Amino acid sequence: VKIATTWLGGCSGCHISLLDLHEELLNLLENVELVHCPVLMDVKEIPDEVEVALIEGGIRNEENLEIAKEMRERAKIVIAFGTCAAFGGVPGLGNLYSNDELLDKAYKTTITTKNDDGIIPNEEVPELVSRVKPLSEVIEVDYFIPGCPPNPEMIAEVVKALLEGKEPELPKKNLCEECARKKSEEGVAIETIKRNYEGNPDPEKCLLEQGYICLGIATREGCGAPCPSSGVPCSGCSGPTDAVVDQGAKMISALCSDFGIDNDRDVDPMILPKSIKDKIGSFYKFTLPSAFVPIRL
Amino acid sequence: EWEPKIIGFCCNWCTYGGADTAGVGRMQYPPSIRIIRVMCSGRIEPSLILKAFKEGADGVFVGGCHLGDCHYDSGNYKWQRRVMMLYELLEELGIEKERLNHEWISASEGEKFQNTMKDFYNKIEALGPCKLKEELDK
Amino acid sequence: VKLSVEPVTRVEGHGKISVSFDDSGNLDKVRFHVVEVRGFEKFLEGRYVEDAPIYTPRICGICQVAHHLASAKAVDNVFGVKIPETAELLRNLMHQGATVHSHALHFYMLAAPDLMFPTTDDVLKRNLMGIAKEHPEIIKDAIELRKAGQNVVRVVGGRAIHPVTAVVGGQSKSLKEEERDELLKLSERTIELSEKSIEVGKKLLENIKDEDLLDIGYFESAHMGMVNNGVHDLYDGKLRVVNSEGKVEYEFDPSEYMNYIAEGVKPYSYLKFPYLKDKGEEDGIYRVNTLSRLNVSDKMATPLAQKYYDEFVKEFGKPCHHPMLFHYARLIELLSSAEMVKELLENDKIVGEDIRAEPEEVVGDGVGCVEAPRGTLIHHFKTDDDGIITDTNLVVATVQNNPAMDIGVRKVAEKYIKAPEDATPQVLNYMEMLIRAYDPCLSCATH
Numbered sequence: 048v049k050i051a052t053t054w055l056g057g058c059s060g061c062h063i064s065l066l067d068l069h070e071e072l073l074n075l076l077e078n079v080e081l082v083h084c085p086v087l088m089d090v091k092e093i094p095d096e097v098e099v100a101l102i103e104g105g106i107r108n109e110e111n112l113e114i115a116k117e118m119r120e121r122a123k124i125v126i127a128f129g130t131c132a133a134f135g136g137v138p139g140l141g142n143l144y145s146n147d148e149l150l151d152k153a154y155k156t157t158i159t160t161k162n163d164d165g166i167i168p169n170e171e172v173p174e175l176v177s178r179v180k181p182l183s184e185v186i187e188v189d190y191f192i193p194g195c196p197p198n199p200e201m202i203a204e205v206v207k208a209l210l211e212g213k214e215p216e217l218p219k220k221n222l223c224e225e226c227a228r229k230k231s232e233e234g235v236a237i238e239t240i241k242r243n244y245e246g247n248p249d250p251e252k253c254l255l256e257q258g259y260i261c262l263g264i265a266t267r268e269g270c271g272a273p274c275p276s277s278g279v280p281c282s283g284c285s286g287p288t289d290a291v292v293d294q295g296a297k298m299i300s301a302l303c304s305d306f307g308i309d310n311d312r313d314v315d316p317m318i319l320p321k322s323i324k325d326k327i328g329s330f331y332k333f334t335l336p337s338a339f340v341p342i343r344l
Numbered sequence: 345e346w347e348p349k350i351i352g353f354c355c356n357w358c359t360y361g362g363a364d365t366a367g368v369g370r371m372q373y374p375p376s377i378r379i380i381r382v383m384c385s386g387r388i389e390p391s392l393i394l395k396a397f398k399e400g401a402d403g404v405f406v407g408g409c410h411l412g413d414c415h416y417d418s419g420n421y422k423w424q425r426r427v428m429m430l431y432e433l434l435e436e437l438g439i440e441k442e443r444l445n446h447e448w449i450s451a452s453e454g455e456k457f458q459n460t461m462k463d464f465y466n467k468i469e470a471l472g473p474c475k476l477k478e479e480l481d482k
Numbered sequence: 483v484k485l486s487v488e489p490v491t492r493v494e495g496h497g498k499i500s501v502s503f504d505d506s507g508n509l510d511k512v513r514f515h516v517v518e519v520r521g522f523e524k525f526l527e528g529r530y531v532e533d534a535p536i537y538t539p540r541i542c543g544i545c546q547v548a549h550h551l552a553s554a555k556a557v558d559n560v561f562g563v564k565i566p567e568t569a570e571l572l573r574n575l576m577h578q579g580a581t582v583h584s585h586a587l588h589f590y591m592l593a594a595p596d597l598m599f600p601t602t603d604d605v606l607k608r609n610l611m612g613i614a615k616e617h618p619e620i621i622k623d624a625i626e627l628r629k630a631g632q633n634v635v636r637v638v639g640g641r642a643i644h645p646v647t648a649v650v651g652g653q654s655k656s657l658k659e660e661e662r663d664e665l666l667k668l669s670e671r672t673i674e675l676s677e678k679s680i681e682v683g684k685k686l687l688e689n690i691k692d693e694d695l696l697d698i699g700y701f702e703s704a705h706m707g708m709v710n711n712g713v714h715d716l717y718d719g720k721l722r723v724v725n726s727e728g729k730v731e732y733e734f735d736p737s738e739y740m741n742y743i744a745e746g747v748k749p750y751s752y753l754k755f756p757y758l759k760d761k762g763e764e765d766g767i768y769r770v771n772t773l774s775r776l777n778v779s780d781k782m783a784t785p786l787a788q789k790y791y792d793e794f795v796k797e798f799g800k801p802c803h804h805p806m807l808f809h810y811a812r813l814i815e816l817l818s819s820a821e822m823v824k825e826l827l828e829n830d831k832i833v834g835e836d837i838r839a840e841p842e843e844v845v846g847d848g849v850g851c852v853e854a855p856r857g858t859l860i861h862h863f864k865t866d867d868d869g870i871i872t873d874t875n876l877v878v879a880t881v882q883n884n885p886a887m888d889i890g891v892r893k894v895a896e897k898y899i900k901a902p903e904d905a906t907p908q909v910l911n912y913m914e915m916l917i918r919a920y921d922p923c924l925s926c927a928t929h
């Protein structure tokens with residue numbers, strides 16, 4: 048089975064996670080036929096007849112778009128590998144700014160930059176596309192593995208299923224399931240919203256109930272909830288469940304609903320918006336490009 | 345030439361009733377809004393609001409029972425907490441806070457709904473069209 | 483005539499090398515282009531400063547730990563808070579494990595294919611799958627080094643890729659005694675493999691000299707690295723700079739970096755061209771990571787590493803400028819980091835409970851710096867009274883080796899190419915070998 052991989056506007060994390068299979072990577076490579084992979088081999092061109100493709104990253108520049116279109120024609124099955132390819136990822140945040148702003152900062156206004164001419168690289172480099180777009184927005188995607196990056200075992204499971212001829216199935220529940228933190232039997236109730244530095248969290252109680260914006264509730268399980276287990280809220284790196292299109296919108300809905308529920312009729316509704324100074328960066332960290340409103344006008 | 349595209353969300357027991365009251369009484373208002381029925385204002389959440397904007401909405405309206413008159417007792421308190429965050433989130437997304445409007449209209453408040461529809465249209469008409477769909481299709 | 487090596491392979495990120503010729507058939511222009519940019523420095527604006535260690539790791543999947551800590555240190559300087567000693571040792575233990583994982587990765591999966599098969603035509607052989615067929619032991623040992631390295635990060639950092647424990651005031655979770663014991667038992671096996679890796683490197687670099695490739699892309703330049711009382715240190719210290727003769731030109735606290743470093747811009751690449759502000763674009767060219775760090779260092783912080791370094795100094799001297807000898811240096815650092823993991827685990831403070839410190843009032847400026855596997859990494863953040871990022875600047879390791887890479891590739895073509903026919907598959911690969919020697923993380927470098 049000829050499998051091929053490539054990367055776009057990502058960080059390479061998904062590929063590193065593929066390598067995080069360790070001993071099993073060799074076992075996997077004896078079952079598949081790796082025909083193209085820029086990080087491991089020198090095969091420059093995407094070959095014809097590719098059964099499965101693992102495309103990492105979203106569409107950040109013009110070359111990314113070409114490659115997506117090229118791999119889509121050469122591959123029978125295309126897989127949006129990771130959160131950046133599936134939902135847009137962290138780079139997506141750049142959608143809050145124009146490309147001109149993004150480029151002027153990196154090549155002009157930076158304190159250590161010395162550009163007297165005031166030029167932006169344009170020779171031999173591709174132009175940036177209007178906004179970071181998930182892979183599904185430019186090409187037909189057959190399957191996807193969510194996670195920033197997806198855990199190794201999950202990547203094996205998906206690839207393994209395709210090799211067997213079966214259809215890959217992703218976990219459907221939200222993170223609280225895997226999460227070991229104790230939940231109140233009466234239900235969730237939030238009193239005050241605290242920033243990650245405000246306070247000393249209790250290691251046993253649910254972080255959302257303690258007043259910290261934990262995205263586990265609006266995030267697909269699979270990762271094993273390492274963030275709350277380590278003492279920090281989930282940032283929603285895996286993205287939403289199959290029944291949720293926009294993760295941030297849903298995360299807010301939930302957060303607002305339970306805020307001051309024990310004083311539901313008389314709690315001030317202006318406490319929450321005044322408390323959260325940066326809303327987009329709190330709920331659309333890894334999914335802004337896949338949101339209904341994925342840019343700032 | 346250009347006429348705003350507004351979408352409405354109305355609770356079955358109060359605003360949808362108020363909307364019906366305005367119709368019976370022949371209380372004329374602008375033909376921009378297209379109302380969607382829900383049983384409670386609590387059924388409305390950020391996703392439906394953002395979805396509307398993505399689709400091309402120049403305005404989004406949400407109606408419900410007055411605070412304390414919810415047919416379902418406390419559904420509108422949850423929506424009230426949601427809409428306050430949303431208002432500011434829309435600003436962060438470059439969408440004017442004024443393009444989203446939420447009111448509490450009862451089943452018989454047909455005169456209030458008529459006037460709320462007149463005002464909101466005048467506000468969205470002044471603001472001009474929302475260029476989100478224009479930029480996404482690019 | 484115009485040839486292009488796109489994409490450059492066995493390097494993190496997108497890059498290409500262009501080789502042009504004039505009408506007479508003579509070598510005209512040889513450039514190194516980086517065709518990717520995401521612009522983190524701008525989108526970080528408006529975000530919460532305490533969230534920087536969540537976004538910056540997403541700059542690169544290989545050295546995410548380095549960005550997590552770098553930001554953490556910066557955030558700790560935004561709020562005037564000094565983290566407890568236990569949190570310093572933990573963060574460091576995390577940083578050392580990541581290096582082991584990084585160095586092992588580059589050397590075995592990205593560099594070794596060329597160092598083992600320098601004169602091969604079969605592209606399907608010049609990779610880890612090809613090495614594993616004739617030498618499975620070499621790849622299994624490499625995998626074990628990474629498995630061990632990432633394990634350390636997963637335990638301390640919380641996640642092997644993109645850790646989340648470095649918070650405001652220190653760490654979110656303390657290392658348990660059971661975890662420490664298991665890690666300490668495994669640490670000895672990591673040191674064994676790192677010693678074996680150096681021996682493998684010796685073998686392979688001899689094969690490189692046997693084909694006269696040890697001098698590819700050679701050029702003399704300054705060198706930068708972090709040192710603590712002159713001793714080699716990747717976590718804390720001051721940034722020392724030595725010239726091509728070895729004399730210490732500078733020594734400063736990372737907070738003053740804007741007075742020593744400057745970044746130039748050329749129209750053919752998204753990667754900038756830095757240099758020593760005072761010396762200038764031509765006189766101020768410098769290099770970072772592996773060798774550069776060994777060059778500026780008086781001695782290594784660990785004993786087993788020091789021995790190999792002393793033997794290396796007697797054989798090549800200080801400062802060494804050979805790009806290909808960055809692979810060797812990388813293996814010395816691989817051992818030193820593996821040794822530091824054991825050293826830090828033995829310290830009883832690592833399992834302490836005083837891991838966090840309440841943050842103080844918000845101070846507008848915040849600079850955090852650490853030596854990432856690929857070079858000096860600086861995270862500089864400016865915020866408002868609430869702690870919202872207003873302006874950011876990132877000087878990421880590999881950007882500091884861009885001029886060296888642009889010059890190096892040019893010197894390879896000058897040595898092997900005289901006409902378009904000379905640019906054969908093996909010759910063109912030599913140019914990528916120069917690039918590879920520096921262990922470039924292109925996504926990292928452009929950010």
Ligand code: NFU
Pocket residue numbers: 494542543544545546548549584854855856857858859878879880881922923924926927
């Ligand atoms: N090591 C490393 Fe990064 Ni992928 C680079 N170059 C960071 O500082």
Ligand code: SF4
Pocket residue numbers: 057058059060061062103104128129130131132136137194195196197540542543
């Ligand atoms: S997804 Fe998370 S991990 Fe996979 S690439 Fe985009 S960022 Fe690096």
Ligand code: SF4
Pocket residue numbers: 222223224226227228252253254255256261262263264272275280281
């Ligand atoms: S922490 Fe985030 S995830 Fe673990 S429980 Fe409380 S909410 Fe669900």
Ligand code: SF4
Pocket residue numbers: 195262263266270271272273274275280281282283284285
């Ligand atoms: S927890 Fe939230 S954040 Fe930490 S990994 Fe699982 S999903 Fe990504």
Ligand code: FES
Pocket residue numbers: 355356357358359383384385386408409410413414415416417418419420
């Ligand atoms: S029923 Fe209309 S407000 Fe709940």
Ligand SMILES: [Fe+3]
Pocket residue numbers: 153157523875876877878928929
């Ligand atoms: Fe930069």
